[PDB]
């Protein structure tokens, strides 16, 4: 009875265990599936999906928190058949997920109508079902800080205000996207450390990355296998150092694992290349072991896939 | 045999009979109405294109083309249920709304595959059913020609060149995008007579809209109602000023009128200063009325209304 999960009755904070805090069972553009379905294959996107969570959960997963919300394809249908098959406790969220500017729906509109939608998923319950979202997303890229993309930071500020559910946030590790959106919601008078500000893992600038963390926010190094943004041995050497520097308070780590994505950039071909050993279980086989080599303790480990979240959904 | 229409068996253009261009049974953002379907009221919305479509048949319309498409909200399925319910010769058509950039799932993917999709939805059919796309919309607005603006006008040329269905364009009448989509098309082969490039009704810069009549294309005096972007009085003149100058072989009118809209722009507050007047109706009762009592006569309305489209079609 505090963090609500897919097709499960919600738990308390204490009960959500090992964790991977940004994990996706699929993505898709909304419109783009809308119109065009035989681009698409949801008996191989659910077996992909299953396939994956199983290993996870294999290796001690208990807990999955999936950051799919508008713009990225939520479904949280497909969400229940996942949780169905696998018995994984699986955090749905609520938000939008732009870059530049929102769909035309909100031309004219006001940040408290878009805060109502986010109020809408967290109390009354997500696409008709009564599966709740337990935290808000929202992003800011390579554009910067828009507009639109201002309006929905601020919007997302009042759902956490007014339902004490977390942010999470996708920026971009290289343009201060990520300490711009933890400026604008503290301001706004959220709770630094109910926000975990995305992708930081993308740069090795430890640096910037400390300085979001010091000023009370989870630091998401959270993209391993994502080579093309940052190799997993530079990730692990900025893990490291960062943990040898005292911040395990505030890391999260993650792969951002899309079990199906539908971007032109994630097809089969350019893998191999781009992200060769991206999956949902590459720390398991990599990260943890090589911090464990490196003198990290089990209890630090603890501290970041088991307590951390448990403290961001308190 | 000739024009494919939503529900029904295929035309001979030259049975297309009194033809309202561009008007809209229903428009939504995909991403919105897919991630809260509370917003939305089916029955309403149906009620709503019902009663407008019938409307327009008392008047004599016999054939509505609705430029609806990925973007924008299209729907085959609630097309075919309006056409049951009122006989209409409905138009449907492929292509892709947008303004700045197109869906992330394009992201690294080429024109030639943005124009497969509009080719599956001509020769194969719309979204899984066996009712096909009869024309290509393209956007181009405010932002002016992005690059993925441009891959999608690019798409729609090669869409056109495969498949000899028409081009109707959205564009800005203030800033040269109607012209620019014009320009891109021809360069790339493609018949300027078969081009409506859209609201050029929205200016009375008579010069601006006789050059892209006299470099061959359609001109879509299209948003009769729509007063925010020019009021039906000036609409008025600019389109008997038109005809007078001899472009009634140019010349097409419609409302653009959205039997249902989504955006906050639309909400019924901002009707009485916005669009007071504005229906799929209007045309009838106030500007071929106008256009009859100043000299216009029976053969340019049909001209207008009949010829016109016909060509496009042909
Ligand atoms: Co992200
Ligand atoms: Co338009
Ligand atoms: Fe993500
Ligand atoms: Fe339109």
Chains 1, 2 share one sequence.
């Not at 878009?114 to 079902?129: M, S, V």
């Not at 970041?304 to 959904?313: A, D, G, L, M």
Request: aromatic share 8%; hydrophobic share 40%.
């Amino acid at each position: 009875m505090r963090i609500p999960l897919v097709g499960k009755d919600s738990i308390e904070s204490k009960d959500i265990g090992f964790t991977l805090i940004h994990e996706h069972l699929r993505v898709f553009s909304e419109a783009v599936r809308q119109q065009w379905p035989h681009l698409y294959n949801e008996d191989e996107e659910f077996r992909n999906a299953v396939n994956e969570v199983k290993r996870a959960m294999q290796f001690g997963v208990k807990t999955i928190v999936d950051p799919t919300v508008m713009g990225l394809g939520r479904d949280i249908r497909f969400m229940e058949k996942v949780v169905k098959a696998t018995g994984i406790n699986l955090v749905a969220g609520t938000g939008i997920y732009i870059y530049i500017d929102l769909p035309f729906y909100f031309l004219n509109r006001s940040i408290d109508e878009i805060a109502d939608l986010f109020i809408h998923d967290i109390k009354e319950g997500i696409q008709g079902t009564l599966n709740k979202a337990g935290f808000v997303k929202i992003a800011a890229d390579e554009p910067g800080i828009t507009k639109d993309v201002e309006k929905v930071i601020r919007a997302a500020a009042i759902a956490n205000k007014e339902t004490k559910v977390p942010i999470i946030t996708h920026s971009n590790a290289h343009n201060n996207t990520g300490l711009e959106q933890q400026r604008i919601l503290t301001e706004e008078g959220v709770d630094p450390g109910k926000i975990l500000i995305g992708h930081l893992g993308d740069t090795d600038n430890i640096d910037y990355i400390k300085k979001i963390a010091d000023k009370g926010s989870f630091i998401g190094l959270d993209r391993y296998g994502l080579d093309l943004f940052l190799p997993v041995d530079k990730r692990n050497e900025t893990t490291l150092r960062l943990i040898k520097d005292g911040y395990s308070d505030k890391i999260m780590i993650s792969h951002d694992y899309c079990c199906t994505i539908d971007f032109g950039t994630a097809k089969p071909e350019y893998k191999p290349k781009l992200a060769p050993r991206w999956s949902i279980t590459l720390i398991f086989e990599d990260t943890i072991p090589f911090l464990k080599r490196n003198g990290v303790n089990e209890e630090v480990i603890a501290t970041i896939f088991k307590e951390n979240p448990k403290k961001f959904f308190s």
